[PDB]
Amino acid sequence: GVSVRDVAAQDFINAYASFLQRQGKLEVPGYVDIVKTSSGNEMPPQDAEGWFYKRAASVARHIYMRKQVGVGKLNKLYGGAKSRGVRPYKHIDASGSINRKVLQALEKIGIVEISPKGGRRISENGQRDLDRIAAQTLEED
Amino acid sequence: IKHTLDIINVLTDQNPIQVVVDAITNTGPREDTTRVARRQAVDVSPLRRVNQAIALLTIGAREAAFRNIKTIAETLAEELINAAKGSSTSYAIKKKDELERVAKSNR
Amino acid sequence: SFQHILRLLNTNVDGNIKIVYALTTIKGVGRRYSNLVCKKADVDLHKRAGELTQEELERIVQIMQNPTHYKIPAWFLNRQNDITDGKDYHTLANNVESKLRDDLERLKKIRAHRGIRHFWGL
Amino acid sequence: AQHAVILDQEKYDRILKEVPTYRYVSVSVLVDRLKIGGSLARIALRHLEKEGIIKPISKHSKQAIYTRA
Amino acid sequence: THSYRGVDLEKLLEMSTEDFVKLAPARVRRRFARGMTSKPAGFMKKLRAAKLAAPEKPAPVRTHMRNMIIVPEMIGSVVGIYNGKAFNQVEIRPEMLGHYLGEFSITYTPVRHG
Amino acid sequence: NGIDYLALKTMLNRDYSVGNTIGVGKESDIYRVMKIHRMHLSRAANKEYQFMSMLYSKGFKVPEPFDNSRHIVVMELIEGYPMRRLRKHKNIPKLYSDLMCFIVDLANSGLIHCDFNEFNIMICGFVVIDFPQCISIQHQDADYYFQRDVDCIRRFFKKKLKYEEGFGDGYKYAYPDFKRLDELVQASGF
RNA sequence: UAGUGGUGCUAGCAUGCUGGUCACUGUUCUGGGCGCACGCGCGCUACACUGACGGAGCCAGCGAGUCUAACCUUGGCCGAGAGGUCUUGGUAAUCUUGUGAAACUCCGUCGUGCUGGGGAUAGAGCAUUGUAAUUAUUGCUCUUCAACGAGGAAUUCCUAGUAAGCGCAAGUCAUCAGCUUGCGUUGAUUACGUCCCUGCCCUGUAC
């Protein structure tokens, strides 16, 4: 058998995000290419056309490995260091509006669902889908 | 370091670890001075010959790679090759010469 | 074909630089404003400025000075809710430091602290 | 003076004939001995390597190392 | 003519305070939304009486209320604004709208290191 | 340590401006300018006064010494401003040229500065304001210190001014070289 | 009030593997003040490629919290952000909290140009604490882009999980630190000696 745990992290992400863009069901907010994704950032995402799908794949993988997550925890994960000009650096959380829509978009296509005890959990169909991409990723070598 | 050895495996063809050893042994000074004022010439122990070799090599690379177009590995690899040869082009060899000729005058 | 220097809005721009960065020679055109304008013009961001043809420098010039028609979110603009007329504007070229170097003089005329302190320092 | 940033046809011919002369090549090697900017060299290496004129021995974003073979 | 954010001067004076606050920037809107104290009401009471009895200008009324917003009802009045020490005399021209009174009376001298 | 006050009495009586504070320093304090040295050995001040008096007895661009007693010295106050913030002088080629010729004079007088650098030149258009730890031309490192001064002044004209019978471009020779009064004040090296 | 494994239920993959859900180890009121030609000192941020920016990977320890009423806040929803709103757990090895921290690692863009280094000074607008933010507490967005090319004479701290790099928590506290103390992460070079300098402690004649 094969699991998502059996594949290199960035290798899996690149494979799945490219596939997900071809499916076309993943729906974009449309304000994309304006938002910085974090108040700590400078300049927007450089891969202007593709970056939304690649983030969507990352979220799915991260939830797959864990019991459940919520929007607050994701904002922490994708945070970073803000320069504060002449002052010392500090940790700052990333944009919420992005990540909440990603969860809702992934739910529309049935990969993920709202869970008791709050937050979201992987669907059995999510498992079934992500495992199949993993098997292709190994065999495509 | 990993990138540095690879480069030396292509510029020249020897087992590059041997080239490192040659550079070290050829660089370490064998005579020096101390202040008395004036300076008096003195011999230097084999251990310190090794320490001086390593210090001079990295400094010669570091100051070449500042405001560079060549990466660290590109410059460090060249120092090692130049020092395995008798090549006075290298910074570390230039430094060795002055220490010994100064010491000669004061002995 | 390739042009090494070009002139627009009475500013000179050299062709040898990425188009997004080259435009920031113009007063008022910051990096983010420059970046978003190019996207709406759908020029190739990776082209160097000397590659573009006249009909492609136009449209860009047009969008810079009429930004609200292209549904730029207004909060992107540097002159929101103007004091005389509640319209929003973006200020460009020599028109920058003509509204600046005026609002302070308007404060001088009203004998406000900040105007006095500025001109007293001079 | 400034290095070239767009590929003239004459330099393209120059590149293909001369590069196999060198034992070792890298981004710095091209930018030093040929008057091209670094933003060309990154593209040219991917081109010539896929063309098979030079042999990769290691690649690491910040460093890449190609050889006569 | 003068105009304020597109509203013409002749429609000003007619505009009420609770209308005017809708044009003002965030600091003013919060101040009124957070509930301005009663203290201006006594000042406003006196200021109206002086204007009404005036033969031509109304002559100064003086106050400590440096933290008070300039509002169209008081255009044209002459006011003496306390300075921590002295009073400074000012006439409310229309351009002063939305400023604080404190901006017109300098609490400190220049310094010149003579 | 009341001598730190009472020491005035000779100068206070023999000297008429009250002066003003200019700056605290580690070895000395400075206050129409008065310099006060810093219990006994400082009455060093005589060495400084006679040294400055000699150089000003020569034609050199140095402040005129007036008077000196009890570790107190009085000097001409400088009109200029410190060279380290200069950026736009109208004749940088002559300024470069003639700063070089100043070094030649010291060498001809047998003396070399330790730190002929922008921290002690004030704005010929310039004056040299102090001579810490000067050495003779005969000292064993005279040429080493000599060439340091030449390169130090060259570096400044390159970095800020972009400049790079006389010396420099427009003259036969680019800059002087060491091979091309010490016995009265034997600061070091006879 | 902790962990592992089995046992019961159960999902995906393949014909075992990774996850979810019994045993063991005097008084008082209103307004102002606590400005800068310059000298001295402890700090913060930089001068870039051993880098800046974008995306992805993903790891701690020491603290602290409410019924006096309103502290630390999970989850859902709204918005570019700052922020708002509806519910919830914890008087605590039990909940916030695996405090998913930064440096760091990998894949791209940039190409030696005060440049995409650096972000002072300044203009417009939106929020938040407070009785009150003008001479301006703090946060967010766009625009303006200054000096600075590794720094003279002088001078500080330090011998191993130490220096240095990097970040967090507490303190004060309506709000507000570039401060103080404590904690963790990554982790060197150079001695293992002396009385030269500085300073301290012992035992009569040129002074």
Side-chain angles (χ1 to χ4, degrees), chain F residues 103 107 112 141-150 176-178:
Chain F
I103 306 173
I112 280 177
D141 298 327
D143 60 346
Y144 167 85
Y145 285 113
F146 186 100
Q147 72 183 3
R148 277 180 57 165
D149 276 346
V150 165
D177 182 25
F178 176 88

Side-chain angles (χ1 to χ4, degrees), chain F residues 40-180:
Chain F
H40 175 283
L41 303 175
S42 313
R43 187 172 61 85
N46 283 284
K47 300 185 177 184
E48 182 167 29
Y49 181 78
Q50 76 188 6
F51 178 75
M52 291 288 190
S53 300
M54 176 280 294
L55 288 181
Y56 188 69
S57 304
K58 273 57 180 170
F60 295 105
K61 299 293 184 181
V62 305
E64 179 165 324
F66 298 154
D67 201 7
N68 153 51
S69 187
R70 294 299 192 277
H71 77 64
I72 298 181
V73 183
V74 181
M75 310 184 70
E76 176 180 36
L77 179 66
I78 297 170
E79 179 270 341
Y81 69 87
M83 183 176 192
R84 77 183 194 83
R85 72 178 67 160
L86 183 147
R87 293 295 184 279
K88 64 175 179 179
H89 187 278
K90 69 270 189 169
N91 198 324
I92 64 183
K94 93 176 182 178
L95 188 68
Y96 172 86
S97 166
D98 301 359
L99 284 167
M100 309 318 290
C101 92
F102 178 86
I103 306 173
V104 180
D105 291 342
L106 284 178
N108 276 268
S109 299
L111 295 178
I112 280 177
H113 206 301
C114 183
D115 288 283
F116 183 70
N117 65 38
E118 66 274 15
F119 291 83
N120 59 54
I121 301 161
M122 295 188 74
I123 309 297
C124 72
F126 70 84
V127 64
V128 180
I129 81 187
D130 58 27
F131 298 88
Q133 72 198 253
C134 176
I135 67 181
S136 63
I137 198 77
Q138 301 178 148
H139 184 273
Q140 61 176 332
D141 298 327
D143 60 346
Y144 167 85
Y145 285 113
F146 186 100
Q147 72 183 3
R148 277 180 57 165
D149 276 346
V150 165
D151 291 339
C152 185
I153 190 60
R154 287 171 69 227
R155 284 169 183 181
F156 185 80
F157 276 97
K158 181 176 67 178
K159 194 67 63 174
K160 264 67 186 186
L161 286 309
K162 314 303 186 187
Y163 174 68
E164 296 189 300
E165 64 173 30
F167 296 94
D169 295 337
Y171 301 99
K172 196 170 291 180
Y173 190 33
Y175 51 91
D177 182 25
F178 176 88
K179 292 184 291 287
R180 265 52 65 163

Side-chain angles (χ1 to χ4, degrees), chain A:
Chain A
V2 181
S3 168
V4 184
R5 281 182 164 89
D6 309 328
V7 190
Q10 72 173 326
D11 198 11
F12 179 88
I13 289 165
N14 290 345
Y16 187 36
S18 182
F19 164 85
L20 191 62
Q21 180 165 181
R22 293 193 308 271
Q23 289 294 99
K25 293 185 181 181
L26 194 298
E27 180 63 294
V28 295
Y31 58 49
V32 174
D33 85 27
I34 289 170
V35 181
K36 290 196 302 185
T37 80
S38 176
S39 58
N41 294 352
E42 180 189 329
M43 312 302 287
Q46 193 165 96
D47 190 5
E49 302 85 352
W51 70 265
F52 196 83
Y53 302 112
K54 188 144 52 186
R55 196 175 206 86
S58 169
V59 172
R61 200 190 87 108
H62 193 278
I63 296 173
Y64 168 100
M65 295 187 168
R66 285 177 178 72
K67 199 168 293 200
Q68 64 277 310
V69 314
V71 178
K73 295 175 199 289
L74 296 181
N75 291 180
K76 197 179 192 72
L77 171 65
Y78 299 109
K82 184 174 67 181
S83 69
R84 301 176 65 236
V86 82
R87 295 181 294 286
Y89 288 67
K90 194 167 67 177
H91 167 71
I92 293 296
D93 321 58
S95 164
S97 183
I98 301 308
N99 288 288
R100 204 198 316 118
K101 290 186 189 294
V102 169
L103 288 171
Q104 292 165 353
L106 290 169
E107 195 288 323
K108 283 178 179 290
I109 69 179
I111 291 160
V112 75
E113 64 175 15
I114 289 173
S115 185
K117 304 187 291 185
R120 273 77 172 200
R121 67 164 64 180
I122 200 75
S123 167
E124 58 280 82
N125 298 312
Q127 292 185 299
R128 180 162 59 82
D129 295 340
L130 273 79
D131 291 346
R132 290 170 189 210
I133 276 71
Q136 295 154 17
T137 304
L138 294 176
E139 187 271 333
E140 194 270 323
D141 289 342

